[PDB]
Amino acid sequence: HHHHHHLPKLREDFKMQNKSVFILGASGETGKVLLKEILGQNLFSKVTLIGRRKLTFYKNVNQEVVDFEKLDVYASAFQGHDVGFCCLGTKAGAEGFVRVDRDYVLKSAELAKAGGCKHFNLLSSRGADKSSSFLYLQVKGEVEAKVEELKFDRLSVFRPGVLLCDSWASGYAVPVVTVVRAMLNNLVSPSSGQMELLENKAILHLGKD
Numbered sequence: 001h002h003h004h005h006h007l008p009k010l011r012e013d014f015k016m017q018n019k020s021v022f023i024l025g026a027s028g029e030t031g032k033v034l035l036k037e038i039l040g041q042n043l044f045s046k047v048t049l050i051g052r053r054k055l056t057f058y059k060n061v062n063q064e065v066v067d068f069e070k071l072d073v074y075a076s077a078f079q080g081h082d083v084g085f086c087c088l089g090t091k092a093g094a095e096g097f098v099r100v101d102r103d104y105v106l107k108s109a110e111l112a113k114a115g116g117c118k119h120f121n122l123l124s125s126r127g128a129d130k131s132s133s134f135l136y137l138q139v140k141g142e143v144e145a146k147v148e149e150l151k152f153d154r155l156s157v158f159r160p161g162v163l164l165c166d167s168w169a170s171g172y173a174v175p176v177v178t179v180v181r182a183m184l185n186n187l188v189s190p191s192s193g194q195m196e197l198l199e200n201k202a203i204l205h206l207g208k209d
Contacts, residue, residue, distance in 0.1 A: 182207030
């Protein structure tokens with residue numbers, strides 16, 4: 001159930017399933033460390049980036065270059081993956097923020113589900129609340145709810161606080177690398193149910209090195 005420092009044993013179990021993964025937002029701060037760790041830990045048989053431009057650099061990685069305003073044209077990009085990580089975030093102004101963090105994320109999640117993705121992992125944010133008067137927390141709240149309605153076999157939502165490159169400290173911040181470690185440790189571990197919600201405190205515990 002709650003295994004201790006048997007995590008390397010669970011990573012090996014996971015490897016032997018020969019799974020494939022896609023990543024959205026691999027160029028972003030969490031995305032890039034997620035990518036690094038996914039490759040270093042060699043947890044998946046295939047890794048695929050889905051984004052708007054080909055990222056240059058590690059040299060056995062599919063990249064699907066897509067147009068997010070026409071994402072249905074690119075639905076195949078979302079087909080055949082077992083696991084998905086959405087680390088998309090935006091700088092952009094208000095309308096652009098909503099476009100990316102809400103619409104592109106949701107559309108992407110709709111297509112992941114329709115492509116048989118089994119385990120979707122959403123990088124949200126501490127404080128998400130669809131009823132928020134903060135646009136930021138509002139969009140996070142709203143995307144979480146909508147993504148939960150897609151009914152992936154397993155959904156993991158991560159609500160880190162301040163991303164670093166109950167007590168105050170348990171909630172406030174977390175190193176990016178710790179968020180990535182939490183995600184991948186959660187990945188190799190038994191599901192706590194169809195939806196899993198991890199707050200900063202839980203991410204700090206699970207992602208400890």
